[PDB]
């Protein structure tokens, strides 16, 4: 109802990331879990006085349960929101919503049936600073967009949320967030994508890098670059604030690096503490509200399709469509050619 | 001899923003000029007390004239470097040394034939944080360059200089670009893919552009540039502009714009006033001194070339191997498709 009632499939990393949220958002109330692991559930059970169980059958079947959220390896993503929207639960399941587009497919498909809501996990997307500069985009103020440049220079390969490094761990992780953050400002299709990867430490043998063009439909272009390896650090370009909000040298918002958005008319560079407009009259800092609650935007979503049956702009569709993108990167990389995308 | 004694041929936007490099490096002496136009011939005869001539036959035919810098527009070049070479005068040409790949050959042969050295005009990868960056890559100390990424937001579109503007972002713009690119990583560019836009009816031109060059050895590049006069990406090179002033009379280095050299064991970004260095041990930023003649580095090649007969970095086939990969970005961005590079 007012509060609502959370159970969640998998208290791994992905969860420990988000709590501060499901804690800290008054709408939230997290009311059971499963996990396979005995000093999670106990964990789970000693900290929120909640009935557990070791698989979600067991969790599913809980009928105070409203919503489940899902942060379990990928691999049981697909089954598990099978289970939940056979059972009336809506589902938030983290970033990937699946690694194959089969997996996403069945998941839409089931939740459409069981007419429960599917939206996907955190994904930086969700972020206000990106969701402010998508309104200006699409208030006309600017014109449509043209170019879009997007960078990120992190330690994800030394220093990660570890399970997410199936060969191409830095693309289904942290170019799912850059794709997600273009595909929001743009606003249209992307139709074709030609992508290089780095794979340069022996001792991390996946990708640690890339370069990517994105030509979107409309003749909007993109180029967006990663790299895990932990040396430059481009929150030197954000004002300084990492990823989750925190200072480096009471948060800000949360970003996933430095980003120029070229509309027709004007730049606009969202940072974690402000948007930054660029426009032919003005030069503008453009003031945001410090978060009360980290990634509340994740949970206006869910809050919102659920007790208010709003469509959810991170749907599984929304999602499946980064993860083809983010297919088409690998095959690109791996293959030294375009991949048209349908 | 001690005093290089130099003939300029083409007193226009070329010539007067090397003006103070010429005026105050002691080892130039300009002795000669030559304009069709009367009132620039009138106003160099005035200021160094000197022959002029109304064509390059003139001041070629000056005894007197050790070597010729040619500023004239870029359609005058090949012929104006013949010429040069005929009388034994070595060539300096501004960038673009020529628009075609015919033009350039015949420079690189009559010179080739007459003895004489080619330089290419100045180019900011003479510019000495580059010059640095590469001497550092050069070493071994970071081990092989796998990456590079840089980007140039600028105004140049509607406040450039004019006579610049087929893509004229991309010959005059993006030859800075892959000159300091191909400095750095130091191999053959073997393919590129581009994308241009062009979104200003007023200016209907190329003005902005993003393209992934691949490298011999596999180390990949992506270049970015948007000349729409929105974002001043000078904002990430501690605020320093192209020519080395400040943006908040000692001044620094010139630059283009943010650039990320990501080497197998570190980064490097080159700066205006510093080179700043990220390896897995230490973060460094290695100061630079402050140039006491702007643009020293193309009279360093020019004097070395003349004087000591040093071959020098920037040469003909140097300059026309960017000219052939500027190219291939527009071949590329006009197409749908990959150029191959020979
Ligand atoms: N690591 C991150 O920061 C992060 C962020 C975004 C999304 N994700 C996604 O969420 C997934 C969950 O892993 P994580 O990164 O949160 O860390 P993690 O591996 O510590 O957490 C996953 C845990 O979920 C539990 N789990 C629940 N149901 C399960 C089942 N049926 N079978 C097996 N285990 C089950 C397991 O005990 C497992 O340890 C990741 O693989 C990734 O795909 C992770
Ligand atoms: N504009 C710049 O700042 C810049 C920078 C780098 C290189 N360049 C290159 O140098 C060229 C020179 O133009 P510019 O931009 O310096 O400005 P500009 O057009 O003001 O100067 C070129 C002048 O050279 C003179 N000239 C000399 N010999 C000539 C001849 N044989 N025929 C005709 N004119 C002759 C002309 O009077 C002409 O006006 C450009 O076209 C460009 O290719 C220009
Ligand atoms: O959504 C997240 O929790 C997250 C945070 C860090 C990187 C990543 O892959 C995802
Ligand atoms: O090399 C130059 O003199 C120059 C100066 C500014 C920008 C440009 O296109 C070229």
Redo the contacts between chains.
């Keep these: 109802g007012h509060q609502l009632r959370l159970g969640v499939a998998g208290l791994g990393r992905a969860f420990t990331l988000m709590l501060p949220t499901l804690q800290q958002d008054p709408r939230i109330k997290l009311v059971a879990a499963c996990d396979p692991r005995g000093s999670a559930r106990a964990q789970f059970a000693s900290d929120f006085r909640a009935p557990v169980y070791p698989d979600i059958e067991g969790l599913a079947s809980n009928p105070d349960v409203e919503a489940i959220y899902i942060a379990s390896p990928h691999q049981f993503h697909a089954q598990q929101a099978r289970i939940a929207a056979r059972h009336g639960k809506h589902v938030l399941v983290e970033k990937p919503m699946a690694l194959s587009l089969g997996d996403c497919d069945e998941m839409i498909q089931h939740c459409r049936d069981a007419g429960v809501h599917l939206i996907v996990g955190h994904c930086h997307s969700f972020d206000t600073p990106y969701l402010s500069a998508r309104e200006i985009v699409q208030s006309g103020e600017l014109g449509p967009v043209?170019?879009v440049?997007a960078?990120n220079?992190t330690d994800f390969l030394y220093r990660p949320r570890r399970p997410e490094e199936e060969g191409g761990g830095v693309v289904f992780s942290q170019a799912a967030h850059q794709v997600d953050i273009v595909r929001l400002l743009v606003g249209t299709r992307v139709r074709r994508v030609?992508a290089?990867t780095?794979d340069?430490?022996p001792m991390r043998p996946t990708q640690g890098?890339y370069?990517a063009?994105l030509?979107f439909e409309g003749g909007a272009?993109?180029?967006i670059?990663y790299?895990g390896?932990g040396?430059?650090?481009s929150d030197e370009?954000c004002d300084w604030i990492g990823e989750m909000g925190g200072d480096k040298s009471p948060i800000w918002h949360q970003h996933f690096g430095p980003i120029?958005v070229?509309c027709?008319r004007?730049?606009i560079?969202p940072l974690p503490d402000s948007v930054?407009v660029?426009?032919?009259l003005a030069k503008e800092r453009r003031s945001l509200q410090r978060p009360v609650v980290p990634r509340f935007e994740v949970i206006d979503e869910l809050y919102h399709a659920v007790v208010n049956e709003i469509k959810p702009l991170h749907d599984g569709v929304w999602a499946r469509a980064t993860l083809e993108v983010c297919l088409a990167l690998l095959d690109s990389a791996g293959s030294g050619k375009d991949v048209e995308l349908p």
């Design positions: 043209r170019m440049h960078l220079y030609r290089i780095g340069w430490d890098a370069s063009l030509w272009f993109a180029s670059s790299n390896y040396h430059f650090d370009w120029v070229s027709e004007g730049d560079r930054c660029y426009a032919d």
